[PDB]
Amino acid sequence: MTLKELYAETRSHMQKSLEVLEHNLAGLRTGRANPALLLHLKVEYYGAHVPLNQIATVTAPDPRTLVVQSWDQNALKAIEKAIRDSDLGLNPSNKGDALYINIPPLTEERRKDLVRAVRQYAEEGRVAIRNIRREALDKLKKLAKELHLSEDETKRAEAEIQKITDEFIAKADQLAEKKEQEILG
Amino acid sequence: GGSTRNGRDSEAKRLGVKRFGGESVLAGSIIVRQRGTKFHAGANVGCGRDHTLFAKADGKVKFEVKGPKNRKFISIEAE
RNA sequence: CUUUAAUGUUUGAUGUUCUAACGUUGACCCGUAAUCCGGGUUGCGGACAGUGUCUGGUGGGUAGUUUGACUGGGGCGGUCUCCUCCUAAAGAGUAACGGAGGAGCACGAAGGUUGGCUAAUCCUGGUCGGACAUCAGGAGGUUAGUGCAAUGGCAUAAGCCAGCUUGACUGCGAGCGUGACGGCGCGAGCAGGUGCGAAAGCAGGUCAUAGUGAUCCGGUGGUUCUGAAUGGAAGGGCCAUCGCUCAACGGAUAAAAGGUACUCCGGGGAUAACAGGCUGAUACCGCCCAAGAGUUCAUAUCGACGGCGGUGUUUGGCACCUCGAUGUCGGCUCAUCACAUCCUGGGGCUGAAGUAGGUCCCAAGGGUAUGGCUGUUCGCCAUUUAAAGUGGUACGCGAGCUGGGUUUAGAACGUCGUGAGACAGUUCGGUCCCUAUCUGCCGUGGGCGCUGGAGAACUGAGGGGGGCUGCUCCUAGUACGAGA
RNA sequence: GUUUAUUAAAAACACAGCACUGUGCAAACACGAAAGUGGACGUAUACGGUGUGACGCCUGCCCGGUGCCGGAAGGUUAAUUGAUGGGGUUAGCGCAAGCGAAGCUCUUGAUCGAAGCCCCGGUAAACGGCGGCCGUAACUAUAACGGUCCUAAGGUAGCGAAAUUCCUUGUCGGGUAAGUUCCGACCUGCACGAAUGGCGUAAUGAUGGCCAGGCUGUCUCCACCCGAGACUCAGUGAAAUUGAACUCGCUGUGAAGAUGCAGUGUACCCGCGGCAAGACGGAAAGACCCCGUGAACCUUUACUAUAGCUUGACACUGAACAU
RNA sequence: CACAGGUGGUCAGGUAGAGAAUACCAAGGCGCUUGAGAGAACUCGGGUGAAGGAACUAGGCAAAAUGGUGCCGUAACUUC
RNA sequence: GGGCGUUAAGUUGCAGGGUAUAGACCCGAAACCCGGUGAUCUAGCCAUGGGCAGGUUGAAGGUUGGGUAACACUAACUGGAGGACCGAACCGACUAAUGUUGAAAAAUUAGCGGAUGACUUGUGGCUGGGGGUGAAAGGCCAAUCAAACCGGGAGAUAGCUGGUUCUCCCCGAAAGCUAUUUAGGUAGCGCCUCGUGAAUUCAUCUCCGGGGGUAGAGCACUGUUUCGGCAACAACCCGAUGCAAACUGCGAAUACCGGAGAAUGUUAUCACGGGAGACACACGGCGGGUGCUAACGUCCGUCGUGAAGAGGGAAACAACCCAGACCGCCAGCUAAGGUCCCAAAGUCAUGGUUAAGUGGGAAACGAUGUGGGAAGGCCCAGACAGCCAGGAUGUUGGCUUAGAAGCAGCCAUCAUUUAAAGAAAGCGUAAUAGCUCACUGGUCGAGUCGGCCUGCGCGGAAGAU
RNA sequence: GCCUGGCGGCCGUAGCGCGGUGGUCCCACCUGACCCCAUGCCGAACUCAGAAGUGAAACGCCGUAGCGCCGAUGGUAGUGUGGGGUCUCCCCAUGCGAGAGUAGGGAACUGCCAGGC
Numbered sequence A: 001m002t003l004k005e006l007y008a009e010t011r012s013h014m015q016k017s018l019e020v021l022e023h024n025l026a027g028l029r030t031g032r033a034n035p036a037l038l039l040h041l042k043v044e045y046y047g048a049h050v051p052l053n054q055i056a057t058v059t060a061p062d063p064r065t066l067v068v069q070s071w072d073q074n075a076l077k078a079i080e081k082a083i084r085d086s087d088l089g090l091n092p093s094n095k096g097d098a099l100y101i102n103i104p105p106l107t108e109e110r111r112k113d114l115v116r117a118v119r120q121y122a123e124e125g126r127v128a129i130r131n132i133r134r135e136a137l138d139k140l141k142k143l144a145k146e147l148h149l150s151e152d153e154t155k156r157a158e159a160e161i162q163k164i165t166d167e168f169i170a171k172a173d174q175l176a177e178k179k180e181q182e183i184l185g
Numbered sequence B: 001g002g003s004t005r006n007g008r009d010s011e012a013k014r015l016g017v018k019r020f021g022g023e024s025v026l027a028g029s030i031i032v033r034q035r036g037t038k039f040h041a042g043a044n045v046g047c048g049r050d051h052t053l054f055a056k057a058d059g060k061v062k063f064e065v066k067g068p069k070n071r072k073f074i075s076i077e078a079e
Numbered sequence C: 001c002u003u004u005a006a007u008g009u010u011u012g013a014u015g016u017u018c019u020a021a022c023g024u025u026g027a028c029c030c031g032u033a034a035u036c037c038g039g040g041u042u043g044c045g046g047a048c049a050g051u052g053u054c055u056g057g058u059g060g061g062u063a064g065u066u067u068g069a070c071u072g073g074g075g076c077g078g079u080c081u082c083c084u085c086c087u088a089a090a091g092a093g094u095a096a097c098g099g100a101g102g103a104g105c106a107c108g109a110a111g112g113u114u115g116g117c118u119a120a121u122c123c124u125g126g127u128c129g130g131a132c133a134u135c136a137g138g139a140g141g142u143u144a145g146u147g148c149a150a151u152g153g154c155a156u157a158a159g160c161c162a163g164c165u166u167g168a169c170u171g172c173g174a175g176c177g178u179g180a181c182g183g184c185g186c187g188a189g190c191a192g193g194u195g196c197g198a199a200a201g202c203a204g205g206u207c208a209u210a211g212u213g214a215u216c217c218g219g220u221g222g223u224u225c226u227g228a229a230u231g232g233a234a235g236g237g238c239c240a241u242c243g244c245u246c247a248a249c250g251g252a253u254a255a256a257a258g259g260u261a262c263u264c265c266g267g268g269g270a271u272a273a274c275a276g277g278c279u280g281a282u283a284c285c286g287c288c289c290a291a292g293a294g295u296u297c298a299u300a301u302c303g304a305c306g307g308c309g310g311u312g313u314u315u316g317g318c319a320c321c322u323c324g325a326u327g328u329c330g331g332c333u334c335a336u337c338a339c340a341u342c343c344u345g346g347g348g349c350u351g352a353a354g355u356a357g358g359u360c361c362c363a364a365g366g367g368u369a370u371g372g373c374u375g376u377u378c379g380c381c382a383u384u385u386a387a388a389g390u391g392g393u394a395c396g397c398g399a400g401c402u403g404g405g406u407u408u409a410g411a412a413c414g415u416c417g418u419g420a421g422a423c424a425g426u427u428c429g430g431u432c433c434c435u436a437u438c439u440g441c442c443g444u445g446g447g448c449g450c451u452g453g454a455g456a457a458c459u460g461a462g463g464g465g466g467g468c469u470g471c472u473c474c475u476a477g478u479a480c481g482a483g484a
Numbered sequence D: 001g002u003u004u005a006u007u008a009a010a011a012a013c014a015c016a017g018c019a020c021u022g023u024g025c026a027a028a029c030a031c032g033a034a035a036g037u038g039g040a041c042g043u044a045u046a047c048g049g050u051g052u053g054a055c056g057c058c059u060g061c062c063c064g065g066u067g068c069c070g071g072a073a074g075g076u077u078a079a080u081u082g083a084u085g086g087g088g089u090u091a092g093c094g095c096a097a098g099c100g101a102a103g104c105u106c107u108u109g110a111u112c113g114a115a116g117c118c119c120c121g122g123u124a125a126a127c128g129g130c131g132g133c134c135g136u137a138a139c140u141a142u143a144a145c146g147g148u149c150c151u152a153a154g155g156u157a158g159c160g161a162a163a164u165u166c167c168u169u170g171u172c173g174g175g176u177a178a179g180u181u182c183c184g185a186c187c188u189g190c191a192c193g194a195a196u197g198g199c200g201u202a203a204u205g206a207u208g209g210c211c212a213g214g215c216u217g218u219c220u221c222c223a224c225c226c227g228a229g230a231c232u233c234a235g236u237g238a239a240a241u242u243g244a245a246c247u248c249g250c251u252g253u254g255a256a257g258a259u260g261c262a263g264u265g266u267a268c269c270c271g272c273g274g275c276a277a278g279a280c281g282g283a284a285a286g287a288c289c290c291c292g293u294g295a296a297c298c299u300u301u302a303c304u305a306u307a308g309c310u311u312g313a314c315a316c317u318g319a320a321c322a323u
Numbered sequence E: 001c002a003c004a005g006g007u008g009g010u011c012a013g014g015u016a017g018a019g020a021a022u023a024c025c026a027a028g029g030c031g032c033u034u035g036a037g038a039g040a041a042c043u044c045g046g047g048u049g050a051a052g053g054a055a056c057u058a059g060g061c062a063a064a065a066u067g068g069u070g071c072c073g074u075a076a077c078u079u080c
Numbered sequence F: 001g002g003g004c005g006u007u008a009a010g011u012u013g014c015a016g017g018g019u020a021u022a023g024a025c026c027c028g029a030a031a032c033c034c035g036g037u038g039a040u041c042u043a044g045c046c047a048u049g050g051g052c053a054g055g056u057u058g059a060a061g062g063u064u065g066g067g068u069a070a071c072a073c074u075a076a077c078u079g080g081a082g083g084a085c086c087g088a089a090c091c092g093a094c095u096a097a098u099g100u101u102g103a104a105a106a107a108u109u110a111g112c113g114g115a116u117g118a119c120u121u122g123u124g125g126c127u128g129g130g131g132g133u134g135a136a137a138g139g140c141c142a143a144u145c146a147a148a149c150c151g152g153g154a155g156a157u158a159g160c161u162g163g164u165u166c167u168c169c170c171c172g173a174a175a176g177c178u179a180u181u182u183a184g185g186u187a188g189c190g191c192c193u194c195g196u197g198a199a200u201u202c203a204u205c206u207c208c209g210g211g212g213g214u215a216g217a218g219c220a221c222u223g224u225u226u227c228g229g230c231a232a233c234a235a236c237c238c239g240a241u242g243c244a245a246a247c248u249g250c251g252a253a254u255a256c257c258g259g260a261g262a263a264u265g266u267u268a269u270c271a272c273g274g275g276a277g278a279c280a281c282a283c284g285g286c287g288g289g290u291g292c293u294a295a296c297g298u299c300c301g302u303c304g305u306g307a308a309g310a311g312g313g314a315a316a317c318a319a320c321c322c323a324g325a326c327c328g329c330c331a332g333c334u335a336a337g338g339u340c341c342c343a344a345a346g347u348c349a350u351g352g353u354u355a356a357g358u359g360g361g362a363a364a365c366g367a368u369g370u371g372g373g374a375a376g377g378c379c380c381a382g383a384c385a386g387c388c389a390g391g392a393u394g395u396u397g398g399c400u401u402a403g404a405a406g407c408a409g410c411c412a413u414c415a416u417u418u419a420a421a422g423a424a425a426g427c428g429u430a431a432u433a434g435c436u437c438a439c440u441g442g443u444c445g446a447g448u449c450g451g452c453c454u455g456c457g458c459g460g461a462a463g464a465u
Numbered sequence G: 001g002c003c004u005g006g007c008g009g010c011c012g013u014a015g016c017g018c019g020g021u022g023g024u025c026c027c028a029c030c031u032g033a034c035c036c037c038a039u040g041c042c043g044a045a046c047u048c049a050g051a052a053g054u055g056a057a058a059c060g061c062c063g064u065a066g067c068g069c070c071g072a073u074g075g076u077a078g079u080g081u082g083g084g085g086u087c088u089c090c091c092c093a094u095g096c097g098a099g100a101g102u103a104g105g106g107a108a109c110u111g112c113c114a115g116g117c
């Protein structure tokens, strides 16, 4: 437990929280021009629900059409039978080694639910990150008080802390912003 | 922080290099923590607690080497 | 007489009653055609209360003070004494807030002496024994061990074992080493007596270098030293010795924490803040190699891993100049320079059809936005624009403007503190001086000089001003383009 | 209403109201060494002190610490009294060694000894405090719920990005063309919270912030004009400052930002009206910073003292009786 | 200081006016102890502004505006 | 034995250097203490008088009528409350401007708040300084306030600042050590001055005698590190290669200590005593810690200089180069640095380089620039360039891939035909195609290609009056 | 002069390893052991009384270079004084001059006494 170690700790925890952010974001239907949308889509195969990607390939040739290439044909069938089963309302097409899923222009209602989802998630993220600092800071107070760090040493530590926090918030900001553009595109 | 301190003077060397007036007992060498660095021999001897090459009766410092396996060895002949 | 009670008596505790001290800010009288004061009478209280000497507690109500230093400004953090090594340039010694560690003790044996002994580790072979217990041989050679740091030393061993012991003795000390000094260290030998050994000899503590406290003030033991008229004695001296993390460890007192923005005084640019300077790790800008992406294709555009520079421009470092005062940020106002060029001008390359771009080179003529939000600069946003450049100029500009930010005194919140107060947290309020001598600008005259004196008109060496750009039409709906 | 006369008028003080608490009168308290005096020619519906600050709805949990109130049975303890043992000295006993009474003395402290403290109970409109950690629901996320460490108790009602919110312009909505302010929300309350009061609240306010209509030279963007100086003349007639001035630009140099040094360029001599870029211009031995074994006020469980408050002994101070 | 500051009480005319406000006057007292010119920038105190109208600014600072009597009529809210 | 002592000439005046006590060189605090003077300012309070133009709102109570069993209640009129309203006087002080050597040590002007009240004012009184008074700011207490003013203790104290007065001559530092509530002060030591004593004493050079563990090197030791060799991935050990302040089986120069000797040096040396100042040092060279082998950085060692040294040199420049100023000289020679002009001295001589204004700023890297020196390869069986011809077959190699046919990628990279002919060097296609390349024949008719050692240049090279 | 023993000198080209060799002279080992004296068990070592035995071991010699060890000449590093160029580094003048390594050396050399031939 050292200043540096704590530092790595804050960066870590924030990385995990940020990752949860991406999890929630990709779990959404922007202007649906994203392949990550169906990434986590675990499909039933061999008795288990394998996450689509480890079974198919999702790429967006054009902003209005998503495709899921599956080296295995039998998996392709069951894949489509999974791209739906949700608010996605995506209709996979069977043609060759992949699935052609047209992204219908998104309704304004679902647009509502979608943009909002992007903001609610964005702030949620920030909250976590901020609290992370709060904790990190306390830990620092106890550290300088315990190890006897010059007012300059401790304050310096604080500066480093805030720095980390600020960066991550920036990351959550971008992710939320880009994801949003997709939903608004 | 937590890194400094140090001993003090403590000479411990030759105070009578080669033949000297070597009074009834000078030193000719106080290199303590030793026995072989300056072995006792000849008219001179002593080598007190702090392994200080005493040096008996008056004469002249010699500085030898005699004795298996090098061995400094010091003594004080006369003129 | 001893162990117990009764009456005499005494005296101590609590507790009641009494008046005669003591009080009465009840009533009345006289002094006196007084409200004080005094004396008297009566009532009340009454040995209490109260006061004096002493005395335990309480006692920021008040009062005198303390509240360390080094410190790469101060504070914080750390440090302050002693020992070991390196820094220490082969004698001694040498600095930092240099790099690493230890000590404040341990031992009646772990001391002495005499006699004897010698490890570590590995291989091989052996009940249980296995990685390593003990045993046997061989190699090996002190790489062990040494009470505890580090250094150096150690076989004649200090390392290890046992027997007998008290030299861990007393008085001294030739002569040296080392300190400013106080002191500290080494010491053969001499005298007295000890112990070990046949003896020569060795032993004045440990292998050595840390294991520490001066003085004062007293305590205890010894001594015909002294002893205030004398004999004693108290006490003083002398010798032995005890008492201080006096550790901020040369130790100011026995005894000491803080606040100041209500502040103040003497000093310092010996010393922080601003701006200048030195520097330039950092920062910004440029270049080197070219694995990679670029469909293919290193170098159109970009570039990993690493290399080298330039600038003074960021974040810093130093503390050189100002602390007998160099006004801080922002805005306003008026600028001036640089070019690492934002626009417009000229070009090379293209992953340049065109129109539009991307990138490099050249170029400093001139030009280079209004508002919303905040004190902001910056920044985000709204809408313009050919474009809304980057930077130097004491982060240009207060003897030109403002005074919103920001450091006085008021006040409040969160917050911390027992608290005074405190905050690079917040909040509402909060006096911005100068008639310009010199330089320099800007304008405007007076002299004299240009060789006789005039009235004029020119020449033109030089110097300055000015140098922006949109959009529309025609070329031509043409070249180009599959079209658009 | 009051206030920093002379930078602060306020969100500060004060107030009516509230609550606690002391006070039986010769009151409490306060001035005073004292006498005495205010309190008050008042007397608990009165007076003092403290905190809060109309009004409305209200005012939770903590007595562990500190203080204050009540108890003091026991533990400890002042002066005081001085039992008791030790010592100096000396009559005498003794070549002497030593012993030693009496008296005078030095010392020892038994014993007696109140309050206070310890102790025992209370007290928060007294000073003052009011938590961490882990698990769980059928999308998920969340967790009424369970459990676990420890408190004197673990912040209730209410309120919350607030005069308290660092991250911060938090996110959302309203306003706008655009809003780091503003208004309404959410609650993740760095670090609101119930008389050092919580939340509201009509009226009031030279009070803080936000918006609008009107209004305009505030501004785009200045123009004209009337008067006072400014300018010329006549009279009188200052000021600060000042080592000496024969008082140019630049580039470098330099105690590190030059009118005076080096190099160079430039410039005939002197006024008047204007401007303030420099003379680190003028003004005040820097108020910031640090230093001095400096200073002054101030705090307090810094230290040592002390007024005051209160304890007991003896004195003034006596007579009895019960146990 | 022959200083635009400070200094208690008394008296209370005419017109208009609510009026000891204010404006013009009576009685009464005065032109403030440097004057003459000129008609600059600029400072000071003012009058007026095309169009626009807070774009100013930390902030509408300051200016501009509003203003009287009678009558009509006047919201949330409220301790009425 | 060892320490302290032993014909050691003292002593009293006079002049002077020093010290102690005193104001102790002089000028200066902020404060502390004592005794008085002040409430004609202001702050409270006491007593007694005075003042508020005008305008407005309309409470409580009352009377009559309604209403009530009677009270509530109600409506008119009456009444005339209020820290009530508007607003002069009067009191106050919210804003702006102007003034800031003012008209004025707080005002003027235009706005502004209260204005029958906790109002305002005249008169006189009472509160006294650690005290007062305070609707509380530390505010007022006579333009003075976190302790008024006046006089005194008093020349408080001031390790701080400033300043310290005539002339000449001789010598001449330190900016260190160790202590220090010590760090900008002090005290002993060191260094200076003066006096009195003392010996070849002291210095340099020569030789003689010493110990040494730095530079360097080396890698047995302590670690570190490679590469190989006997390890169900690597220690040990073998050998080959490096590394170290806290490594050393090696080891300088060198300094230092001692002995002898020559010369030289107005005793330089040692001791004692009177008098000091000093205990911020700065730069440069070398050996170094730190810092970035950054800083006109910081800290030690050591030498020189400045400090305390002028002169000449480096443009200008306390330290760096030369060189130490007794004075006068219109003499002569030299150091450093210089010799075309400003500007003293060669437009000097000999051979060579350089062509960029290099000279007269800068790196990695980049280039048929160019001077010198050695050496190699291929070549009239024709080298080198250019020019004409050729570059085929298995085969589109296998895999991979939608396709991969020399040329996405992986593997292989042979054989045949030959004068030569890569399972192919780049471009290119979706893949082929196609184009160019290796290399080969002829032509051509004498040299050509790159390396090496060295000297001088070029680019890279952007800043603010 | 051979050989050996004791004591020293000097402390590696004196040591180590490998082979040969010496013995009733001297040394060893060895015989025995109640005894002097000895074992933290042991006559192993110390200690004593001494046959027989034998040079095995140990030791003393001789040869041998595989491992140590010594070690140039030259050249290199560094360095004192002087000077010069440069970012930390180096060059020149001049004295001094390692280490490592190369050539090579090298299987000790001695003095006193005593005892045998």
Ligand SMILES: CN[C@@H]1[C@@H](O)[C@@H](O[C@@H]2[C@@H](O)[C@H](O[C@H]3O[C@H](CN)CC[C@H]3N)[C@@H](N)C[C@H]2N)OC[C@]1(C)O
Pocket: none
């Ligand atoms: C963190 N949120 C918590 C929520 O998780 C829940 O927490 C309770 C916690 O307060 C209890 O705690 C209670 O019991 C403790 C002793 N066992 C002492 C403290 C007391 N509050 C736990 N026993 C059970 C939790 N589920 O209820 C209270 C809350 C504040 O909302």
Ligand SMILES: [Mg+2]
Pocket: none
């Ligand atoms: Mg006090």
Ligand SMILES: [Mg+2]
Pocket: none
């Ligand atoms: Mg005092």
Ligand SMILES: [Mg+2]
Pocket: C069
């Ligand atoms: Mg200090």
Ligand SMILES: [Mg+2]
Pocket: none
């Ligand atoms: Mg040394």
Ligand SMILES: [Mg+2]
Pocket: none
């Ligand atoms: Mg020891």
Ligand SMILES: [Mg+2]
Pocket: none
């Ligand atoms: Mg000390």
Ligand SMILES: [Mg+2]
Pocket: none
């Ligand atoms: Mg001062």
Ligand SMILES: [Mg+2]
Pocket: C269, C319
């Ligand atoms: Mg300075």
Ligand SMILES: [Mg+2]
Pocket: none
């Ligand atoms: Mg600075």
Ligand SMILES: [Mg+2]
Pocket: C276, C321, C322
């Ligand atoms: Mg300066």
Ligand SMILES: [Mg+2]
Pocket: none
């Ligand atoms: Mg350019």
Ligand SMILES: [Mg+2]
Pocket: none
């Ligand atoms: Mg604006």
Ligand SMILES: [Mg+2]
Pocket: none
């Ligand atoms: Mg803007």
Ligand SMILES: [Mg+2]
Pocket: C398, C432
């Ligand atoms: Mg000004």
Ligand SMILES: [Mg+2]
Pocket: C403, C404
């Ligand atoms: Mg302000």
